[PDB]
Each structure stands twice: as structure tokens, then as C-alpha cells.
UniProtKB/Swiss-Prot annotation:
PROSITE patterns: ALPHA_CA_1, ALPHA_CA_2
Outcome of mutating Y4H: Reduced proton transfer rate
Active site: H61 (proton donor/acceptor)
Effect in UniProt of substituting G141R: In OPTB3; complete loss of activity
Membership in a protein family: Belongs to the alpha-carbonic anhydrase family.
Outcome, altering N59A: Reduced activity
Noted disease: Osteopetrosis, autosomal recessive 3: A rare genetic disease characterized by abnormally dense bone, due to defective resorption of immature bone. Osteopetrosis occurs in two forms: a severe autosomal recessive form occurring in utero, infancy, or childhood, and a benign autosomal dominant form occurring in adolescence or adulthood. Recessive osteopetrosis commonly manifests in early infancy with macrocephaly, feeding difficulties, evolving blindness and deafness, bone marrow failure, severe anemia, and hepatosplenomegaly.
Keyword Metal-binding: yes
Gene, per the UniProt record: CA2
Result after altering N59V: Reduced activity
Role according to the record: Catalyzes the reversible hydration of carbon dioxide. Can also hydrate cyanamide to urea. Stimulates the chloride-bicarbonate exchange activity of SLC26A6. Essential for bone resorption and osteoclast differentiation. Involved in the regulation of fluid secretion into the anterior chamber of the eye. Contributes to intracellular pH regulation in the duodenal upper villous epithelium during proton-coupled peptide absorption.
Protein name per Swiss-Prot or TrEMBL: Carbonic anhydrase 2
Outcome of substituting K15E: In Jogjakarta
Resulting phenotype, T195 to S/V: Reduced activity
Length: 257
């Protein structure tokens, strides 16, 4: 099916998923000098106090840390968002080298990786219904640059050996997502889509200005993961990012000056 290789990568996705050349596709390049400061935006509210992590899984494209979203235990509100959005999962996109890996880019600059915290609008009852709405999802994007280690990320790094191949999953209870956030919550926001098939245009993207730092050793372990399933020829899980798409008829708003 779809992938990130030469014969099934982003350049090929539009064939089975024509929305790939749609009206509001993601990611996009954030031209910092074109974004409009919007004083009408309210403060961003990240309430991960009662977040309950359950499991970590390698789905063949990346790995997801899933959360219990049966109640409002970990939610995102405020900013450009109307209503409450529940955290359902988070995952990363990274490169084979430190100079690439992020999906969104800032003034064309590519970061080593990008963290995506996925939330869905509770007014729609469930995730499956939410992805069918223009304001169904809110994804918080955080850039990762290589430098000093991120303490809150180590617990994830250490369990990657147990989910090396496609299909594998491990228990991952009691993980605190708050440990992955940078100091500042300043951000850029625009209407977009999922960055992987089915590329549904149901996302309000919230991209933080301040990146977090991870160590060379930490990212190296991400690159040891496999796209393939157990007992198959090894394909390192690297460069699982979609390149920037045309902004088209959209405007990027900034929460800061
Ligand atoms: Zn993502």
C-alpha cells in the first residue's frame, strides 16, 4: 500500500487518495513574515493533568502512544479552537539525518523531527466521526532539534526496542505527555489535513514556535525502528515525513508578534 519509498511515497498518494491535491492539504511551509498576528486569539490551554496513556504501537509508518479518551482527561482548548478536543494519540515524523525530518517547515527550514499530539472535537462523539468534519481534529505540532537530551522523552526511547517491527505493541501506562512540551506556547495556526493517507481535511493545525531539544543518542534510537514486520528484510524507519504542500487559498495566523 502507501509508504515513504520511491515507488509508494508522497508523490504517488494522489492516485488512491485524490484529496492529496486538495484545497487544504498539510504540511505547509510557515513563512514567518507572511503570518498575521491575531490578537483575537485566546491563550492556548493544554490540560494533560489526568492523561492516561495505555499502549505504544509500531504501525509500519511510525509509532503511536495511545491514550484513554473515554472521558475528558487530557484536553486541548482555547487558541483558535472552539470547544473541547480530547487527546487520543501522539507520534513523530523524523529523518535519516539531522537536517531533515519535520513535515512543516519554518521559512523553509527543516527540523530533525516533528511531534504530533492528536486531539478530536468531543462535539462529534468519537474520533471516526470527527475526521469527517472540517473542525474535527486539532493537532499540536512540536519541532525537535538535536542538542541536549529531553528527559521526558527517554521513557519512550527506552521502550522502542520492544516494538522494533510493524505490528508490535507494548504496554505504556503512566506516561506524562506534559514532559514533551517546550517552555513557550506561542504558535502558528491554519486549517489543514492529516499528513498521511487518507489525508482527510479535518485538521486545525497548531504549530509551536519553540522547538524542544533531543539528544543525538535519542534520535538515533528512533532510526533503529523498522518499517517492515518481523522476519522480513530490514527497512529502517526513517524519513517518514510528507514534504510541504501548496498553501493555496489559506492564511497562517500567529499568536505572537
Ligand atoms: Zn503526524
Amino acid at each position: 500500500h502507501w509508504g515513504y519509498g520511491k515507488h509508494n511515497g508522497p508523490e504517488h498518494w494522489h492516485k488512491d487518495f485524490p484529496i492529496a491535491k486538495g484545497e487544504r492539504q498539510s504540511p505547509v511551509d510557515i513563512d514567518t513574515h507572511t503570518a498575521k498576528y491575531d490578537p483575537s486569539l485566546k491563550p492556548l490551554s493544554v490540560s494533560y493533568d489526568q492523561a492516561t496513556s495505555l499502549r505504544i504501537l509500531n504501525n509500519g509508518h511510525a509509532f503511536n502512544v495511545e491514550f484513554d479518551d473515554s472521558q475528558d482527561k487530557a484536553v486541548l482548548k482555547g487558541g483558535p479552537l472552539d470547544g473541547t478536543y480530547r487527546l487520543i494519540q501522539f507520534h513523530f515524523h523524523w529523518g535519516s539525518l539531522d537536517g531533515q525530518g519535520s513535515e512543516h517547515t519554518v521559512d523553509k527550514k527543516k527540523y530533525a523531527a516533528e511531534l504530533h499530539l492528536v486531539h478530536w472535537n468531543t462535539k462529534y462523539g468519537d474520533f471516526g466521526k470527527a475526521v469527517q468534519q472540517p473542525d474535527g481534529l486539532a493537532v499540536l505540532g512540536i519541532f525537535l532539534k538535536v542538542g541536549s537530551a529531553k528527559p521526558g522523552l527517554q521513557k519512550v526511547v527506552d521502550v522502542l526496542d520492544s516494538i522494533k517491527t510493524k505490528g508490535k505493541s507494548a504496554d505504556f501506562t503512566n506516561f506524562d505527555p506534559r514532559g514533551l512540551l517546550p517552555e513557550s506556547l506561542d504558535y502558528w495556526t491554519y486549517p489543514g489535513s492529516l499528513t498521511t493517507p487518507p489525508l482527510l481535511e479535518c485538521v486545525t493545525w497548531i504549530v509551536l514556535k519553540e522547538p524542544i531539544s533531543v539528544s543525538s543518542e535519542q534520535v538515533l534510537k528512533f532510526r533503529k525502528l523498522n518499517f517492515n514486520g518481523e522476519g522480513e528484510p530490514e527497512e529502517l524507519m526513517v524519513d517518514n515525513w510528507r514534504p510541504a504542500q501548496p498553501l493555496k487559498n489559506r492564511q497562517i495566523k500567529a499568536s505572537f508578534k
